[PDB]
Amino acid sequence: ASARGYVNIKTFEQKLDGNKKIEGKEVSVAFPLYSDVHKISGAHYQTFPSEKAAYSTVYEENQRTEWIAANEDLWKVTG
Amino acid sequence: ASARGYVNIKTFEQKLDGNKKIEGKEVSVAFPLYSDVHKISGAHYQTFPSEKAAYSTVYEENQRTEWIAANEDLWKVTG
Amino acid sequence: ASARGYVNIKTFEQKLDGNKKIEGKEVSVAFPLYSDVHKISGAHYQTFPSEKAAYSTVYEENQRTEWIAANEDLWKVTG
Amino acid sequence: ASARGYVNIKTFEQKLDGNKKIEGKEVSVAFPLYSDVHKISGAHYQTFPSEKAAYSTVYEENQRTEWIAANEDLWKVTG
Amino acid sequence: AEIKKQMEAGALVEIAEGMATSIAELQEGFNGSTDNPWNEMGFRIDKQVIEA
Amino acid sequence: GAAKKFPALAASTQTTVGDIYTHFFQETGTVYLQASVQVTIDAGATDAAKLDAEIKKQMEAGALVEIAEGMATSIAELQEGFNGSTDNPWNEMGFRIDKQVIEA
Amino acid sequence: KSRQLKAAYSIELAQDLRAVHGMDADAELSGILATEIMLEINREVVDWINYS
Amino acid sequence: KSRQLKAAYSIELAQDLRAVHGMDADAELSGILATEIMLEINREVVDWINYSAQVGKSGMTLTPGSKAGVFDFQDPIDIRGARWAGESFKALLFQIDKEAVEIA
Amino acid sequence: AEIGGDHGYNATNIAAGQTSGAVTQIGPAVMGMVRRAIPN
Amino acid sequence: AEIGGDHGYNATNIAAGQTSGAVTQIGPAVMGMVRRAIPN
Amino acid sequence: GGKYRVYIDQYAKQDYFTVGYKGPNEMDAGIYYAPYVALTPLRGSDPKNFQPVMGFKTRYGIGINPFAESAAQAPASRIQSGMPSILNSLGKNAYFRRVYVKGI
Amino acid sequence: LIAFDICGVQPMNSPTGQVFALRAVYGKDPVAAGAKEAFHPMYGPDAMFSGQ
């Protein structure tokens, strides 16, 4: 536990082109990590605070660059 | 890590009674944990701040009771 | 019993020199005996009054010199 | 002999750490030598003046550095 | 609950008393005594926060 | 320095990064140096004259630099055994007075 | 019989406490010390009445 | 962060320092301790400036053939081909201006 | 967007002024200090 | 003994007013704000 | 040159100069020295042996000018210590540049 | 002594002060990796930001 709470982030699946889309995702980010970096703007998302991580995938405070990479990945286009 | 810093606590070996001694201990307590609960009064000790635990034995933010017990153990008497 | 109460004496073991120690001791002394003669001061000790002797070794008033020697012996240093 | 008398220094054994001791030493130092160099501050010791060296180990005036090293050794800790 | 039953019963009675002078006079190492510190107290100063 | 002692910087000392090592140069005086690079001093330099020269080279290269620091209040407050603390003396100083003579 | 208490406070506490909160760090403690001794005595008397 | 110093003089010393030499043997120590504290503090500031300072004669303040961080008066690149004291000293002044500019 | 963001409703984050948005805050100031009365 | 104690030399601990001693602080006062200069 | 205030590092270890910027404000200088308590005398005697004891205490604190690093668009963790160390000031402060000098 | 004309001061009347700093940041991620500063002294403006 970050003991500073978490920012819970949901990315809503959206279609981009014929056989192209951005996959939906549900992640939790330690508050200080979220506070350090967020690339979530214009992303088709929704966020909220919590005492404990809301989702099974969590980026803890000491992960830094795993989270930064995860943010780039919230825009990834797939099938 | 505490991701903040620690209060490093060093006690010195003391004799207590016939064939009884107070084992010296070297521990690192996450600063907010130390701030929340401590008993370091009459411990035959020295303290200092650090970014990273100065010692191999560390009590982090989420350990709480491991630390409370560890603190009381500073006066534990052995051989 | 002394029928006058007791003075209970505890001497805390201390080191004196290399392989030399002044052994910890627990004795009870009839109150009037303690009042009459004692050599305990400066000894690394504690005392208290009681109705009945607190310790297994008790010097009843009719000891006089067994007691005086026993008190001096609180300073004896051994292996 | 210095023919100016001596300063006699005796140190006492200390339990510096677990299985570590600073042994007491008996050193007689020529008065003018002691006077010139004496680190014996915080040494856990006793002293006195004398006509003749009081101890079997004596540092004469013309020894200078034998004494300085011996002086430093007063705090030496061994097993 | 069990303690209170014993108190009501008169088995355990609420008590307080001062200390022997012969102990107080030596408190915290006087005249060679040992391991007998004065009891002591302090104060703290904690805090709470809210949000709109 | 009243909080802790530091290891001496000497021939073939290997310095860890971030630690402070100390040295008295035979000229210019006392230096407290914080390691920036893990380096080994090279005990080819034995006599102080060579040791001082090597230390200065490590300083020139920025592998070890001048540093000074105060005492945490959490330490200073209990300096000299307050509240059960131990082995934490204040540093102290004073003066001497000596003499010289001449003859006619 | 005797009854006694100690406070033992630091200088740094007093300096910072005043600078930040306006409190003295001596007056609060002298208050508490005297207070606890008086409160405890008053209870002792009540307790002996219930005891006896 | 804190600091502090003690003097701790004995009675007997003071009695004779006054009787023989006219010393206060108290006030002089207050002088000495206060002085050492002030001197150390001032030094701490200088040590930190040198600590935090960047390596100069580096980056855009370099001459391509230079040694990076050190100005050597015997090196024709650093002194820009200068001769005798009269020209080689001026070369140092030039490097000083370059440093000042990079700071801006 | 210039997001205000929020605290985690975590007392440390609040006391320290740490936010999830663009701007770090100063502090929660002072509402006064609470003390107990002495028993009668 | 009553200990003032200290902060942890860590900005979270400091910003929050946490101490190693008896007394919790209001916060680390105010030293103003530093602005970035605009290019000429 | 009528431009730089030159001071002598009376205790320099090797041979160098540091060029630095200092603005008109108390808050524009790269590094700051911030006094809180100074030269408080303390006096007493130890009844054990009656020898007098005296000394002095102070409290200061130092720190880094925000943006002194001048090598980043943003800090990590957003709440940081301004106290200098191996991670945030060593060889990084925009206000000062150090050059060693040889061959004088 | 060199006094203190080689450093700033920012003196304290109470311990432990704090200072803020403001940065102008572009790209809709003011708090982020790669979130470039608009007025940094060593970097030019992203000339083709508002442009082509």
Curated annotation (Swiss-Prot), chains A, B, C, D:
Keywords: Capsid decoration protein, Capsid protein, Virion. It holds the Pfam family Soc. InterPro entries: Soc, Soc_sf. The keyword Transmembrane helix does not apply. Coiled coil: none annotated. Its main location: virion. It is found in: Virion. Transmembrane segments: none annotated. The keyword Signal does not apply. Belongs to the Tevenvirinae Soc family. HAMAP family: SOC_T4. Capsid decoration protein which helps to stabilize the capsid against extremes of pH and temperature. Once maturation and expansion of the capsid has occured, trimers of soc attach the interfaces between the hexamer of the major capsid protein. Acts as a 'glue' between neighboring hexameric capsomers. Dispensable for the head morphogenesis and phage infection. This is Small outer capsid protein. The gene is soc.
Curated annotation (Swiss-Prot), chain F:
Signal peptide: none annotated. A proteolytic cleavage by the prohead core protein protease gives rise to the mature major capsid protein during virus maturation. Belongs to the Tevenvirinae major capsid protein family. Homohexamer. Interacts with the portal protein. Interacts with the capsid vertex protein that forms pentamers. Interacts with hoc; one hoc molecule associates with each capsid hexamer. Interacts with soc; this interaction reinforces the capsid structure. A total of 960 subunits of the major capsid protein forms the 160 hexamers. Major capsid protein that self-associates to form hexamers, building most of the capsid in association with pentons made of the capsid vertex protein and one dodecamer of the portal protein. The major capsid protein self-associates to form 160 hexamers, building most of the T=13 laevo capsid. Folding of major capsid protein requires the assistance of two chaperones, the host chaperone groL acting with the phage encoded gp23-specific chaperone, gp31. The capsid also contains two nonessential outer capsid proteins, Hoc and Soc, which decorate the capsid surface. This is Major capsid protein. It comes from Enterobacteria phage T4 (Bacteriophage T4). The gene is gp23.
From Swiss-Prot, chain L:
It comes from the Viruses. A proteolytic cleavage by the prohead core protein protease gives rise to the mature major capsid protein during virus maturation. Homohexamer. Interacts with the portal protein. Interacts with the capsid vertex protein that forms pentamers. Interacts with hoc; one hoc molecule associates with each capsid hexamer. Interacts with soc; this interaction reinforces the capsid structure. A total of 960 subunits of the major capsid protein forms the 160 hexamers. Belongs to the Tevenvirinae major capsid protein family. Major capsid protein that self-associates to form hexamers, building most of the capsid in association with pentons made of the capsid vertex protein and one dodecamer of the portal protein. The major capsid protein self-associates to form 160 hexamers, building most of the T=13 laevo capsid. Folding of major capsid protein requires the assistance of two chaperones, the host chaperone groL acting with the phage encoded gp23-specific chaperone, gp31. The capsid also contains two nonessential outer capsid proteins, Hoc and Soc, which decorate the capsid surface. This is Major capsid protein. It comes from Enterobacteria phage T4 (Bacteriophage T4). The chain holds residues 106 to 157 of 521 of the full protein.
